[model samples]
Target: DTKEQRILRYVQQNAKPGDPQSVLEAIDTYCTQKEWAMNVGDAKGQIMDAVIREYSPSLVLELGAYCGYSAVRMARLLQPGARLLTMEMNPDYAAITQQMLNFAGLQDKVTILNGASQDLIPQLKKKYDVDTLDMVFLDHWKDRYLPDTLLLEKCGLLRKGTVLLADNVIVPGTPDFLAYVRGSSSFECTHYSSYLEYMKVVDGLEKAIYQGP
Candidate 1:
């Protein structure tokens, strides 16, 4: 079995039903001591968690649902009646996400969809009744960051005070995404210096608050 399989197996053997904390620790332990899988490790994940906690968002959107790590992390912390919609293009990843989230008892808080962002963003706008996204996390391919941010604006999903938090903006470096966020007066951008996922090196996250259209 692959690393992903083993991670799931570990959870099946050790995790408790309806326990988000246990689910989070299981994945983190596996990634840290077992195989070093990519699920935004504890370092960056804590920062992401902090942002989610501060926002207390009701409608959260994520670009990547890799292994369902962030989904559980964010879902458990969301305010009452909040929903997190995470998009994953890979079918295998999407299936794994469903199983993991179900194991964590977070299926009620999260909606996992399978498709590329280009095809799904518009659909999300209508399907989720997203007039304004409270928060958006970008943890997918580095290249899609800028395009999708622009797409979010065009879709009328982002409005004043919308928070856009993007990960891996330094190590794998999203120059274009960074430029747009930093350059646009419509956004108030703040850089949080941190290490990359599962590694101690120069990496960071960007918290860009949309000021207007």
Candidate 2:
């Protein structure tokens, strides 16, 4: 989408290369002021940041890398020795997100992988030596939320207390994902009231704490 190009131009023109917050603000301006980007937006991002800071997660997984807005938000608050891995299926989105993160000085804090979530979730166990994830932020296709959650379980990546925070759970709702997490004894969840990204319509995030096997 040309929106990606606009984002690239906005960041290069408005943000300093080594300022993470500025990168976020630039994207905010572009999305709110000019065009709407599928970023997590500043409101939902606060909830995400709070979860990261509260957990002080050593390892984090984000299912989608839309415009890297959430990356900047979460990466900025990660404590020392912490890492966030975000996956994007679109190579163009991956590249654009990488550039945006690079400008944020978060290039080292977050890893942007270009591929399907199904292919990458398993590799985390071996390639990255991720025995278990500390946190997961689901922001990809709504349909994939439940499947990826199961895959994480099958791969033994989710341990007791792994925080799974998902976006767009209401506006573009994920009933199956919501239902599974709510019904499963393995997880405890709470829904947040909020608006959809870049628009003032009803939306929310589901915060589920993995209770382990």
Candidate 3:
């Protein structure tokens, strides 16, 4: 079938039914399975879960939450009151994310904000009475990775020894962000080398767990 036909069929078939998994599965099937979803797919979601287990953060901050897929995964690992304030540029996406998260028993734990990274950063700092962030996941617009992260840093959003995981470094590629971390010795980077999807090319995304003073 043509791509247009595929899209129309997918949307009609996936019209939200309010069931959490149903909505999420529909999204996964249509959004991520058929197209490029900004959400950090299952592969990366696993890593983020592992990070939660390792760090056991009291507060979690996500730069981009396309559909709360990663947030659902993170919710599985977070402790009670360990809230996740994740930002999204689009409200429609945030609504879908919120619905899915609620279905996964994660709605109370995660807040899907409808705003860009820069706009919400300051707001979060005040709303939560947080001095620094314990965990951060940057899986948003790739081009803004470095600048947005730096924005978090300058605003003192991240605490010392924060586990800052940046996704899709190798797939779409983020040379500027990678270079910044590599050039700085303070960051302990983990490289997950794997072949790119639907291609013969090989690449592994980078995970930088920053250690700040």
Query: What tens digits encode model 3's per-residue C-alpha lDDT throughout 42-148?
Result: 55555566668988988888877765667777775788878887888877777766766765666777778888888778776687677788878878888888998
Task: For candidate 1, write residues 1-213 as lDDT tens digits.
Answer: 667778987887777988988888888887778788778777888898889888788899999998898888899898778899999999989999999999998898898999999899998757766778899999999999999999999888897889999988998889999999999999999999988767778799999999985
Q: Which 10-residue span in candidate 2 carries the lowest summed lDDT?
A: 45-54
Model 3 TM-score? 0.80
How many clashes in each structure?
0, 0, 1
The residue-by-residue lDDT of candidate 2 on 63-83, one tens digit each, is: 999778888899889887799
- Scored by lDDT, model 2 comes in at 0.89
Mark the regions of model 1 whose C-alpha exceeds 4 Å error after superposition.
none
Steric clash count of candidate 1: 0
Cα-based TM-score, every candidate? 0.96, 0.97, 0.80
Q: What are the root-mean-square deviations of the candidates from the true structure over C-alphas?
A: 1.1, 1.0, 4.2
Off by over 4 Å in 3: 1-36, 194-203
